[PDB]
């Protein structure tokens, strides 16, 4: 319904938050690893019944009190470890999400030639198995010239995590540029292009992907359901992690950003608009990738389910493959990788704006604010240093370990702990009134049943059956060794143990010197809790 060109700019500014590398890069690869038919039902169930409720909760919780992901734990000071856990998640994201941007900068710079290198098998990195889309009987185990460019030129992939080999100086140069553009923007800190350029660019590659032979096999493998893979806890863990991750849940940036939002803003409306358009965008970005896998399937002579069973890298095997079938091919490659760059840098900007803000709110005001630039610089320096091994010859083995464990189901359990802490310790009764003070209407009954019963029930059983059914992680038939999966668990629970660790620390610091009344003193709200100066029904 028409609104004099004003509200449509609020829609397009919202749309620009929904599209990101969390769905242009991350959704298709998980969707393939789980096998599309199996992933789509769990993804929708977890997004409807858990993700959207926890997204709206994190927005409201921050907007109401108007405090960052740490200082909002003034409802129950004992649980401030949930906020520190969200900073451990945010610091695992920042280091690896810049090497996803290295690869984007490398393919963007690499597109500055007369011929795209990944188009043919006539290059020195290529094996005898290279099939060639444009290029006797040769091979039993054929490969795409784009799989070999990725695996043997971009990243000279070692056979193991232990073989760090040598650092990829071109990718490390891109890590430098990536961290500079980020840091420089945090000093400088038009909508239409940011919010639409991804969609017109995805539509070009989609209309291309649809017209290729065998695309329907890829689309069919994407959409026909697998009601046979349904009891695998890993599918529900991955689907839950993607439903929470792609919305920004348990990165803590949501709360911190919402703290700047107007007290009477409609965070219900903004949660539906962002999450519904994010859902659709993910399904679209996945559709185009699968329409390309359908083409690689008959081009290589194998079942769609085993064409390119990667992790990170699917978007750097598949989108490159499709670009070589477009006319004026390098122009669209430059525009495509520039779209990925400006999608990625936009989330690093919001992540690092958050991370610095929360670290400042935690400390004595004047000197830490004089240090604002120096601390942002310290984060970008430390983010480059911790990124070096991901540019090593073993890099993506660690990239999949951080993304599949440190930044996966940990987001779901950290936000489940918040869900129960607010609903049962603070009290749903008290919280729904707090929402009603700023929206004017109570939460829809759907969110009331979801927060109180569904979300802890679903999350609890996915947690239990994942522990029962766990299998060693594999990147495309490289099976990870015993020490590596042990580091995976340590990164995964490094952010969760922050909760009980702070609980021990407060139960030591707090007054009481008795068994349980000190836990009651530690769980009830702070005297400073609630909104700023004027906005009090109780105060």
């Amino acid at each position: 319904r028409g609104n004099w060109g004003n509200q449509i700019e609020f829609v397009l500014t919202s749309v620009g938050y929904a599209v990101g590398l969390g769905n242009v890069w991350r959704f298709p690869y998980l969707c393939y690893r789980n096998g599309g038919g199996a992933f789509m039902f769990p993804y929708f169930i977890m997004l409807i019944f858990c993700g959207i409720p926890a997204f709206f909760m994190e927005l409201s919780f921050g907007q109401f009190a108007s405090q960052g992901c740490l200082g909002v734990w003034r409802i129950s000071p004992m649980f401030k470890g949930v906020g520190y856990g969200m900073m451990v998640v945010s610091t695992y994201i920042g280091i690896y999400y810049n090497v996803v941007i290295c690869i984007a900068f490398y393919y963007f710079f690499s597109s500055m030639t007369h011929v795209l290198p990944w188009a043919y098998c006539n290059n020195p990195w290529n094996t005898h198995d290279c099939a060639g889309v444009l290029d006797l009987t040769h091979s039993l185990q054929r490969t795409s010239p784009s799989e070999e460019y990725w695996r043997l030129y971009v990243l000279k992939l070692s056979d193991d995590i232990g073989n760090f080999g040598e650092v990829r100086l071109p990718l490390l140069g891109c890590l430098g540029v990536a961290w500079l553009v980020v840091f420089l923007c945090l000093i400088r800190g038009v909508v239409y292009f940011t919010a639409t350029f991804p969609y017109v660019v995805l539509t070009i590659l989609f209309v291309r992907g649809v017209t290729l032979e065998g695309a329907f096999d890829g689309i069919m493998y994407y959409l026909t359901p697998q009601w046979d893979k349904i009891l695998e806890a890993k599918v529900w863990g991955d689907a839950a992690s993607q439903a929470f991750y792609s919305l920004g849940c348990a990165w803590g940036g949501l709360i911190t950003m919402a703290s700047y939002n107007k007290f009477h803003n409609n965070c219900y409306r903004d949660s539906v608009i962002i999450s519904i358009t994010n859902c659709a965008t993910s399904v679209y970005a996945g559709f185009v990738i699968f329409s390309i896998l359908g083409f690689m399937a008959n081009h290589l002579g194998v079942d769609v389910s085993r064409v390119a069973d990667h992790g990170p890298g699917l978007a750097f095997v598949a989108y490159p493959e499709a670009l070589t079938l477009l006319p004026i091919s390098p122009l669209w490659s430059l525009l495509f990788f520039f779209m990925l760059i400006l999608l990625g840098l936009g989330t690093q900007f919001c992540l690092l704006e958050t991370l610095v803000t929360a670290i400042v709110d935690e400390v004595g005001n004047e000197w830490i604010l004089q240090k604002k630039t120096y601390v942002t610089l310290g984060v970008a320096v430390a983010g480059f240093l911790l990124g070096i091994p991901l540019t090593s010859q073993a890099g993506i083995y660690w990239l999949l370990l951080m993304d599949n464990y440190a930044a996966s189901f940990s987001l779901v359990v950290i936000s489940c702990i918040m869900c129960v802490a607010i609903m049962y310790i603070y009290g749903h009764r008290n919280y729904f009134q707090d929402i009603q003070m700023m929206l004017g209407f109570p939460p829809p009954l759907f969110f009331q049943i979801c927060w109180r019963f569904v979300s802890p029930a679903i999350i609890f059983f996915i947690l239990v059956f994942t522990v029962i059914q766990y299998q060693p992680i594999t990147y495309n038939h490289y099976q990870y060794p015993g020490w590596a999966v042990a580091i995976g668990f340590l990164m995964a629970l490094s952010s969760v143990l922050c909760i009980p660790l702070y609980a021990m620390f407060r139960l030591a610091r707090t007054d009481g010197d008795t068994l349980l009344q000190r836990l009651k003193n530690a769980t009830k709200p702070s005297r400073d809790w609630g909104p700023a100066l004027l906005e009090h029904r109780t105060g």
Partner: nanobody
């Protein structure tokens, strides 16, 4: 390496039908859009039709729409132009074409031998 060889031309009366075949070899033709053109006597080489890699989208010249049907059989490495409701102005040398962009800023048009159609 790339070769294109058309067949199916000749004399036909107005209101008649012909099916031109183009046999393609020397490349993975399933990856390419295929095109048809015609060169009428005393006239410049004109576009007639195009077909997607899978045959999902098929496009035609405004003076041909609804009269000719383009189709392909990627197992045989062929593209066909089914010509119906032929009229004298359809008299031309019909050429089969593929444009290899080579993952570059330009294309090499590869041309078939040309097959004459003559409509009385």
């Amino acid at each position: 390496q790339v070769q294109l060889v058309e067949s199916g031309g000749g004399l036909v009366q107005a209101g008649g039908s012909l099916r031109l075949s183009c046999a393609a070899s020397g490349f993975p033709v399933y990856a390419y859009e295929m095109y048809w053109y015609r060169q009428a006597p005393g006239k410049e080489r004109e576009w007639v039709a195009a077909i997607s890699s899978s045959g999902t989208w098929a496009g035609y010249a405004d003076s041909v729409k609804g009269r000719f049907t383009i189709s392909r059989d990627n197992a045989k490495n062929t593209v066909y132009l089914q010509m119906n409701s032929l009229k004298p102005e359809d008299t031309a040398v019909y050429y089969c074409n593929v444009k290899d962009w080579g993952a570059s800023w330009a294309y090499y048009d590869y041309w078939g031998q040309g097959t004459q159609v003559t409509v009385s």
